[PDB]
Design a protein around this motif. Sequence first.
Motif, short mmCIF file in Angstrom:
data_model
loop_
_atom_site.label_atom_id
_atom_site.label_comp_id
_atom_site.label_asym_id
_atom_site.label_seq_id
_atom_site.Cartn_x
_atom_site.Cartn_y
_atom_site.Cartn_z
N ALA A 1 0.85 -1.20 0.00
CA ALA A 1 0.00 0.00 0.00
C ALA A 1 0.88 1.23 0.00
N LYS A 2 0.29 2.31 -0.53
CA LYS A 2 1.15 3.47 -0.85
C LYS A 2 1.28 4.39 0.32
N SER A 3 0.49 4.19 1.34
CA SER A 3 0.59 4.99 2.58
C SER A 3 -0.12 4.26 3.69
N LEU A 4 -0.04 4.79 4.91
CA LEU A 4 -0.72 4.23 6.06
C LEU A 4 -2.21 4.19 5.91
N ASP A 5 -2.80 5.31 5.46
CA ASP A 5 -4.26 5.36 5.29
C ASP A 5 -4.72 4.50 4.09
N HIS A 6 -3.88 4.42 3.10
CA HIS A 6 -4.20 3.55 1.93
C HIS A 6 -4.22 2.08 2.35
N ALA A 7 -3.25 1.69 3.16
CA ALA A 7 -3.26 0.39 3.84
C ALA A 7 -4.53 0.11 4.59
N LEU A 8 -5.02 1.04 5.40
CA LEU A 8 -6.22 0.83 6.19
C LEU A 8 -7.46 0.72 5.30
N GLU A 9 -7.55 1.54 4.27
CA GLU A 9 -8.65 1.34 3.30
C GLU A 9 -8.48 0.01 2.59
#
Length: 205
Positions: free
Chosen positions: A94-102
């Motif tokens: 994932a490209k960022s922390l929030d992208h990971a969570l989504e």
Amino acid sequence: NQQKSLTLIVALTTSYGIGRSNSLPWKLKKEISYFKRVTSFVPTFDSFESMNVVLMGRKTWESIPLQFRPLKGRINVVITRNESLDLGNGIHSAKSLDHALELLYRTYGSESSVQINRIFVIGGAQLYKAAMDHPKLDRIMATIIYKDIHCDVFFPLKFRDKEWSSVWKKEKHSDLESWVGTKVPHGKINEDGFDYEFEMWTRDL
Ligand SMILES: NC(=O)C1=CN([C@@H]2O[C@H](COP(=O)(O)OP(=O)(O)OC[C@H]3O[C@@H](n4cnc5c(N)ncnc54)[C@H](OP(=O)(O)O)[C@@H]3O)[C@@H](O)[C@H]2O)C=CC1
Ligand SMILES: COc1cc(Cc2cnc(N)nc2N)cc(OC)c1OC
């Protein structure tokens, strides 16, 4: 994108050093078994259904002994912009922390046979910097190493020092054991000449 709180797990010297030469400057057998226990625990009732998630930076992913990869019994995510060609038999990128969570919330819905229990950020310094800014980070599992080991990579916020003492609070040991669901050694452990100790810190969101 939202729901659960984030937990950070780190092993650090009293000088906030966390690594050297893209490795740990210490070989601590019991420290890794603690790591393993904490990141793997799910309550028995919930045990059929649920697993924990481990989020890491790409260079940490690269640092883990090829043998230890991927982290068994945990959903592993690697954060990378240069995802390009990840390599994983169902290890996510994932490209960022929030992208990971989504991604996790999409992949592991109420369809999924696999549901998520806890999410851990396990390093390195760059990802730690992002998680310390994240509005859902509320807890830090720290291993304190009582030696000034030469490091070249440092933890980004001095959470144990006076300037942060009205935000970050150290919890009692019995609260530690309750959260990780097992007895944990109280006080100092000595292994290979290093004294160290297990702590849990929390903040209000
Ligand atoms: N003491 C401890 O508990 C731990 C220590 N360590 C140590 O930390 C060191 C590595 O730390 P560090 O170099 O900072 O690396 P990281 O493990 O955090 O990996 C850095 C890379 O991850 C990606 N990345 C990280 N954060 C973000 C973000 N917020 N958004 C997008 N991409 C991101 C980028 O991937 P890309 O460049 O591919 O786009 C970036 O170059 C090693 O020495 C390791 O041993 C690691 C874990 C625990
Ligand atoms: C499981 O093996 C490793 C684990 C870790 C991460 C880690 C290790 N211990 C603690 N307390 N917190 C962490 N985030 C980091 C590693 O090297 C950088 C490892 O290679 C052994």
